Design an enzyme around this catalytic site. Sequence first.
Site, PDB file in Angstrom:
ATOM      1  N   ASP A   2      -8.154  -2.840  -7.125  1.00 16.02           N
ATOM      2  CA  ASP A   2      -7.527  -2.644  -5.934  1.00 16.02           C
ATOM      3  C   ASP A   2      -8.580  -1.809  -5.043  1.00 16.02           C
ATOM      4  OD1 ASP A   2      -4.694  -2.419  -4.272  1.00 16.02           O
ATOM      5  OD2 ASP A   2      -5.946  -0.570  -3.806  1.00 16.02           O
ATOM      6  N   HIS A  41      -7.007  -6.284  -1.590  1.00 16.49           N
ATOM      7  CA  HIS A  41      -6.023  -5.229  -0.935  1.00 16.49           C
ATOM      8  C   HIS A  41      -4.669  -5.678  -0.228  1.00 16.49           C
ATOM      9  CE1 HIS A  41      -4.465  -1.104  -0.383  1.00 16.49           C
ATOM     10  NE2 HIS A  41      -4.584  -1.028   1.260  1.00 16.49           N
ATOM     11  N   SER A  88       0.945  -1.313  -0.175  1.00 18.72           N
ATOM     12  CA  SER A  88      -0.011   0.009  -0.054  1.00 18.72           C
ATOM     13  C   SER A  88       0.961   1.341  -0.118  1.00 18.72           C
ATOM     14  CB  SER A  88      -0.918  -0.115   1.155  1.00 18.72           C
ATOM     15  OG  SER A  88      -1.557  -1.355   0.971  1.00 18.72           O
TER      16      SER A  88
HETATM   17  C1  LIG Z   1      -3.994   2.129   1.251  1.00 20.43           C
HETATM   18  C2  LIG Z   1      -2.811   2.957   1.544  1.00 20.43           C
HETATM   19  O1  LIG Z   1      -2.196   2.877   2.511  1.00 20.43           O
HETATM   20  N1  LIG Z   1      -2.448   4.053   0.707  1.00 20.43           N
HETATM   21  C3  LIG Z   1      -3.495   4.782  -0.514  1.00 20.43           C
HETATM   22  C4  LIG Z   1      -3.194   5.722  -1.510  1.00 20.43           C
HETATM   23  C5  LIG Z   1      -1.509   5.811  -1.559  1.00 20.43           C
HETATM   24  C6  LIG Z   1      -1.222   7.163  -2.198  1.00 20.43           C
HETATM   25  N2  LIG Z   1      -0.856   8.243  -2.276  1.00 20.43           N
HETATM   26  C7  LIG Z   1      -0.671   5.520  -0.498  1.00 20.43           C
HETATM   27  C8  LIG Z   1      -1.871   5.370   0.853  1.00 20.43           C
END
Ligand SMILES: CC(=O)N1CCC(C#N)CC1
Length: 337
Positions: free
Chosen positions: A240, A284, A144
């Site tokens: 996602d 995810h 992520s």
């Molecule tokens: C799910 C998560 O941690 N995210 C989603 C958006 C991404 C950007 N810019 C980094 C942070």
Amino acid sequence: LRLHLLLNTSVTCNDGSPAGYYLKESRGSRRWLLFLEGGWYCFNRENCDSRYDTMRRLMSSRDWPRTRTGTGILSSQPEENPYWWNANMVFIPYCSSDVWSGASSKSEKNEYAFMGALIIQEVVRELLGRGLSGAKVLLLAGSSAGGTGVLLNVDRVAEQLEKLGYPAIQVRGLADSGWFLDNKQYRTEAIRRGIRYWNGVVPERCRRQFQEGEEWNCFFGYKVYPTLRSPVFVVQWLFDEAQLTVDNVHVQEGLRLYIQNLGRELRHTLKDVPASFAPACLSHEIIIRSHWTDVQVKGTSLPRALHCWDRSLHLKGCPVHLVDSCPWPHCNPSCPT
Ligand SMILES: CC(=O)N1CCC(C#N)CC1
Ligand SMILES: *[C@@H]1O[C@H](CO)[C@@H](O)[C@H](O)[C@H]1NC(C)=O
């Protein structure tokens, strides 16, 4: 994995507490795995204050536990991790709220410190004195926000070891669920306000392409990846959940065409990415999940594709580019339930 707080207490989490890392050595191994945790971000005072009330472990080390169980690619058991079960394992907690891009200290003009990029550099420095000096491969992975952080930092880690006199260590990257599209919503500015808030830094070649005021472009995989020199393997669900959240998607013709077009666009951005794994699933993250060995693309699991990647960097029936072509979430039977 055992917790170590950074000996350089000037490298801190958001609230000024020291950053750190969890470690588990494997002394008959010259392979090192450094994983970056994820968890969104915050881009102003009012929004970071809300994060501090209810997501404090992502902003401070005062309540961290002394140990943590390695799971998925961080597992030391061959049954759970067929890829790198014998490697040295490092888990770097995400306590800077800056997508690992910041280089700003707490001061009289700053309520919070944003030092994500400096946390990675300090961890690498202190690890060299615990066995990293003898490594032959350093895999920087993340999920992520950590997956995006891999793309922003992998080349700086390679440059750091070069200037420190370790040319024999091969630095590589593994970006999980950090390959986002700046597409139109169903019903970019937060990142741009964030970079100013954090004093964020991006890779040099990408910075020189888009130039001042437009560094936010380097947070998006398909724009920053062509500027990178280190090998990077890309894992990305075609649908996602975090991408659908930011697109305001939660089925009629309109939404059906939207979702089908999103998978088509993501598949297009990966056509020329030689090391990739992109299943047609709505999910995810994956790589530290215990059941990360279950999903397959064209009959090849993710742990196998990563092993094939290792061999290519030294093939018959050992593929490295794996992207689904079917157009709807969970048309791949091996998708997580
Ligand atoms: C799910 C998560 O941690 N995210 C989603 C958006 C991404 C950007 N810019 C980094 C942070
Ligand atoms: C501690 O970290 C800061 C920030 O990167 C750096 O300027 C300083 O030189 C470091 N101190 C030591 C002793 O390495």
